[PDB]
Amino acid sequence: LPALKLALEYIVPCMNKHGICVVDDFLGKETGQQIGDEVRALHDTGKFTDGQLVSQKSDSSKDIRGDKITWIEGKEPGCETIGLLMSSMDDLIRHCNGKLGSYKINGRTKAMVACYPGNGTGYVRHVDNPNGDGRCVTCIYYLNKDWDAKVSGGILRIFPEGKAQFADIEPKFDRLLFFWSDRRNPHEVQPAYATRYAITVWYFDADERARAKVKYLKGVRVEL
Numbered sequence: 001l002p003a004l005k006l007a008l009e010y011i012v013p014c015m016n017k018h019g020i021c022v023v024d025d026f027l028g029k030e031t032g033q034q035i036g037d038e039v040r041a042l043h044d045t046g047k048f049t050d051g052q053l054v055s056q057k058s059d060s061s062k063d064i065r066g067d068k069i070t071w072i073e074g075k076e077p078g079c080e081t082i083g084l085l086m087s088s089m090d091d092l093i094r095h096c097n098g099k100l101g102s103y104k105i106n107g108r109t110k111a112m113v114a115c116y117p118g119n120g121t122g123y124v125r126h127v128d129n130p131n132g133d134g135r136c137v138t139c140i141y142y143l144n145k146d147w148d149a150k151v152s153g154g155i156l157r158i159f160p161e162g163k164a165q166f167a168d169i170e171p172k173f174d175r176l177l178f179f180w181s182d183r184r185n186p187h188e189v190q191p192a193y194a195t196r197y198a199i200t201v202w203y204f205d206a207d208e209r210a211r212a213k214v215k216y217l218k219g220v221r222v223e224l
């Protein structure tokens with residue numbers, strides 16, 4: 001699918017109606033596989049953090065750690081297919097510009113690459129952007145060949161505002177997900193029993209981010 005077609009015929013109407021959108025087979029398998037090798041390579045060469053402290057036991061031999069991360073700009077040695085994905089995410093968003101809510105997306109973060117190490121850790125119920133920091137859309141790409149959740153866990157459970165029900169999304173190979181970052185979409189990752197990779201970028205709305213600047217707040221100091 002051409003990027004603009006996916007945008008106009010799927011991502012735009014779906015986001016505006018449901019605020020959660022799944023595109024399967026986004027880059028195809030040669031390119032997915034390649035991103036996979038790049039992410040595994042970052043892992044094996046120790047580029048990730050050790051993982052979120054889950055259980056801080058008193059003896060610390062026995063501390064339990066969870067999701068590991070690394071931030072990627074997209075041009076680093078070893079990361080060029082990741083840079084490629086990011087560029088591809090950007091192209092898709094830019095083809096939706098204007099058309100997702102009344103937002104005007106002018107910015108994103110670096111890619112946050114996450115590895116749930118498969119030791120039964122997950123990620124607690126949260127909202128990505130609760131306090132108005134400018135992030136309007138979360139975009140995650142999943143890396144996980146032949147993932148079977150019945151076996152390996154690691155479902156993303158989203159809990160849309162004012163719904164009795166949730167939405168389970170499997171972290172399937174070459175799947176791209178978008179959802180609104182704010183309190184509309186509380187979500188969690190259920191415990192993962194196999195190594196589970198995902199790559200997230202967040203997109204900024206211009207107005208929200210411009211006044212987050214003010215609210216939050218050397219520099220951005222000047223003078224006297």
Ligand SMILES: O=C(O)CNC(=O)c1nc(Cl)c2ccccc2c1O
Nearest residue numbers: 067069114123128140156187189198
């Ligand atoms: O990976 C997934 O399917 C969903 N993950 C997340 O919702 C998620 N969200 C945040 Cl805000 C963080 C934040 C830091 C590290 C990992 C995160 C994470 O996996």
Ligand SMILES: [Fe+2]
Nearest residue numbers: 126127128187
């Ligand atoms: Fe999240």
